[PDB]
Structure 1
């Protein structure tokens, strides 16, 4: 439970809303027990008094206790469910901010896109499980413990031995039964997560490879193996229902043991009285009622294992070391920037390596050519400072790139990534992301000037766009990435692969889009195409991580060379 400490410290912010929602749970449970305990005594005392004791018996105080106990029993439960859920959402927001504020310095490579991005569904699910800790674990367990102690202390004023055995049975099952059932059903819970993921693997390998399995005549043999896993999976599921069935029967026998013990022991003597009379019902009805506080307590402990497991994943995922550090110097963004590389790798090393060592002037459009299969360029990762370069040094305007703070580095460089993202927000917010201070007119002009005239439809900027709403096509989505880079207005622009997967009618249209609108900027492009390299200068041909040829298109093409071979033939 050490791994759960960093998230319990998030509860300090709302220690009043969280604690009040527990106090209302105890008051509701104390009124639940008090209503049936007072009622049991009131029926006994009235019957013992009889009609002859109508005037002697004070029946207006107990009859006002049942009114008060029946009002806080129903009003307290309404407010408990209300305050608990309010505070559950106020720590969900705190949990959401806490993890997002710690996954930002780790954003490019700290996550590393592990498990084929099945990672981020398991982070929303694990954050939603640390949310359950207060309402599914802490509230049922803390509430039950101090309900037991109050009735144990309360009944002590009448009889010490009776109060201790009733509370002792209730305390003993609060501390013994939940751990014993979590320990008894831990082998099955392990054998059920393993068999669930084994069936999921055998199913995905059976649906993905249905074409292969059918033609090779084995689609009915792997169905039998798939069906045999489900039989073993349903047995693990069945055996965790026999413990739940056995834990619900034992809770009923323990609550039966308390009622019978009070009947047998409280009839002997109550508080040193040979003839307890109406007192006998005060104890057997406080034992009938007090075991509803123990109803949620075994399931609460069962969930604490799930919460602890999620806390470990969130603590290891966001408890890493950032790959880069940004010094804070409050530098001034340059109006014109000249990117200077010096012996820096272009892709990852392979097959077991001098750098590019290029130079880009203040406003030169430069393109970098590379073969498709050799590797994926890490120039934009290193230029946006996703990770520090192992060798060489990047200079932005004759100053090392590490000296720029995060605020100013993001403003000198505006990239159009290959994988461009549609935020689930209005089209205004997908554009206002780049320049947060633009007006509705400026956004309208850019949307027209990039060729996104369709998006400026009757619905307009306010139209929802993203996962929930509209989905954009690759060519239309590519123009959205350029729209952000035009609004961001950085002196340097990096283009990962501006035309990949686009047909020639829109592949061209993008090229004069970049040329006509990024004419004053220091654009540096990376492509595996030779369509629009004519409008650029100092085309760089990369071969095995080395510059083999460099120069403008006409000069580079005029002489026989590698770029000449690319133009005609494979």
Structure 2
């Protein structure tokens, strides 16, 4: 239960609004006990006085008391909800944005330890689960403790044994029953939080792989695995209902005990007199109405085992230290970039062998480099080292003869343009898919780069306002490839890392793209990775990798003459 401290500390930004809801939750309860307690005494006192009591019994004061309590009861509860729900969902909105802010610093390797379907559950579903902590844990518990003390102290003036008997039952239920139901529903709450994220992960994975699962006949047995999670989830959901049912049955029996005891004990004597008269109804009707202050008390702690389980999920995500950290010093983006690598080594997390083994190359400013090798030789791993995705072990990378770890992130991203091997089409519009790089580009500039790269088709119909990605138009494989090139051409960085840019493109489009890149990417440092040996005569150096090490190196003419591994690639 100690895991809730980082989240109870979020009260402090709304301390007034959340404490006002506590005060209104006591005024509402006090007026609620009073309305039934005053009515119970007023009726009995009026009847005892009888007809002869008129002109001598002050009946106007209770008449204003019930009218005042009725308005206070209804208005206080309404304003408590308005002020407590307003503050709770401002805390949940800040905590959701805070949780999302921890994702990008962990993007390459920290997020790989997690599952993409349960990460979604943590930010949108586990954050909403914490509204129990801010709405119905503190206010019911401290609201029900002040009310009982006020009732017990108030009833103590009339009698002591009666007040402590009613108040004793009311505290023996406030202090013993909630922890009993927290312990009973602790295991179910853990499962209920865990199984919801397991189902949301299996459902999104089943929805995202529906093309591969459907044809290979695997949707049926992945839905059976999916349906089973729901059976277990619905079973844990059912157990929480059986405890809620038992909570109401027990709470109704305790209120029965208070009503029976007050009837049996107040009749004997209230305050030391044999005939209590109206005071008998003053205690019976209080015990009959005082137990609506303990209505939300038991459910407050029962659902706590599920809130604590949720709180651990957000705490785990927000307690992750990103592997790569950036200096805060401001620096200016250079116009020319020359990169130097000296014995760069790198082992992927939870691996024994090395993806990169002692890579050393010197790329001068403005030189165009082509990297070649078999699949799995570390070509993309090398290109992600230059992007500071991971920190190389026992290796040093230099941009302009300065360490790449000494660049501000807002300056590192402005000096490197990347075309990844796998392109992502965001759900946003076509304009916002191109405004990732160069957010200040105008609509005329966006349209021009699309015409150059061969995507003039996207300018038809809705065009720039057209919704792409999921929920909209899905581009083909060769149209995603040219949209990634459009993103990097808009970025306009001195150093460009192309990871198989002409992949899945026909000969006509590849010729047009390679012609565009040669003209566009002049006086720009380029590290062009491809498995395609076309247009390599215009690259100053050709790097051939194998198993994380550079095997051969030289110009296109030199490599052919030497008949190295590049020769078997070409022939």
Q: Same fold (TM over 0.5)?
A: yes
- 1:486-544 C-alpha deviation (Å, 9 max, x unpaired): 33222111223324455556555543443343234212122333345455442211112
1:35 Cα deviation after fit: 1.8
- Inter-partner Cα distance in structure 2 for 1:519 and 1:135: 61
1:401 Cα deviation after fit: 1.0
- Retained in 2: the 8 A contact 1:332–1:408? yes
- Inter-partner Cα distance in structure 2 for 1:96 and 1:218: 35
- Inter-partner Cα distance in structure 1 for 2:480 and 2:155: 72
Q: Give the aligned partner of residue 38 of structure 1.
A: 38
- In structure 2, list runs of 5 or more residues that go unmatched: none
- 1:186-218 C-alpha deviation (Å, 9 max, x unpaired): 566678889999999999999999999999999
- Retained in 1: the 8 A contact 2:28–2:77? yes
- Retained in 2: the 8 A contact 1:342–1:357? yes
SS at match of 2:417: strand
- Retained in 2: the 8 A contact 1:345–1:355? yes
1:480 Cα deviation after fit: 3.1
Instruction: State which drifts further: 493-502 or 274-283.
Output: 493-502
- Inter-partner Cα distance in structure 1 for 2:229 and 2:189: 16
- Inter-partner Cα distance in structure 2 for 1:169 and 1:85: 31
- Inter-partner Cα distance in structure 2 for 1:461 and 1:80: 48
Instruction: State which drifts further: 303-312 or 495-504.
Output: 495-504
- Inter-partner Cα distance in structure 1 for 2:217 and 2:490: 58
SS at match of 2:349: coil
Q: 1:250 to 1:401 in 2, by over 3 A?
A: same
Instruction: State which drifts further: 34-43 or 442-451.
Output: 442-451
- Retained in 2: the 8 A contact 1:475–1:506? no
Instruction: State which drifts further: 466-475 or 397-406.
Output: 466-475
1:252 Cα deviation after fit: 1.2
Q: 1:280 to 1:371 in 2, by over 3 A?
A: same
SS at match of 2:441: coil
Aligned-pair RMSD on alpha carbons? 4.2
- 1:273-313 C-alpha deviation (Å, 9 max, x unpaired): 43322222222222122212222222221221112122222
- Retained in 2: the 8 A contact 1:36–1:286? yes
Instruction: State which drifts further: 246-255 or 157-166.
Output: 157-166
- 1:379-404 C-alpha deviation (Å, 9 max, x unpaired): 23221212211122111011111221
- Inter-partner Cα distance in structure 1 for 2:122 and 2:222: 29
Q: 1:108 to 1:150 in 2, by over 3 A?
A: farther
Give the length in aligned residue pairs: 568
- Inter-partner Cα distance in structure 1 for 2:218 and 2:422: 39
Q: Give the aligned partner of residue 53 of structure 2.
A: 53
- In structure 1, list runs of 5 or more residues that go unmatched: none
Q: 1:112 to 1:221 in 2, by over 3 A?
A: closer
Q: 1:340 to 1:75 in 2, by over 3 A?
A: same
Q: TM-score, normalised by structure 2?
A: 0.85
- Retained in 1: the 8 A contact 2:100–2:123? no
- Retained in 1: the 8 A contact 2:430–2:466? yes
- Inter-partner Cα distance in structure 2 for 1:106 and 1:436: 23
- Inter-partner Cα distance in structure 1 for 2:214 and 2:474: 35
Q: 1:518 to 1:195 in 2, by over 3 A?
A: closer
- Inter-partner Cα distance in structure 2 for 1:464 and 1:209: 22
1:425 Cα deviation after fit: 4.0
1:375 Cα deviation after fit: 5.1
- Retained in 2: the 8 A contact 1:536–1:552? yes
Matched, 1:386 2:404: no
- Retained in 2: the 8 A contact 1:413–1:494? yes
Matched, 1:490 2:503: no
1:461 Cα deviation after fit: 3.9
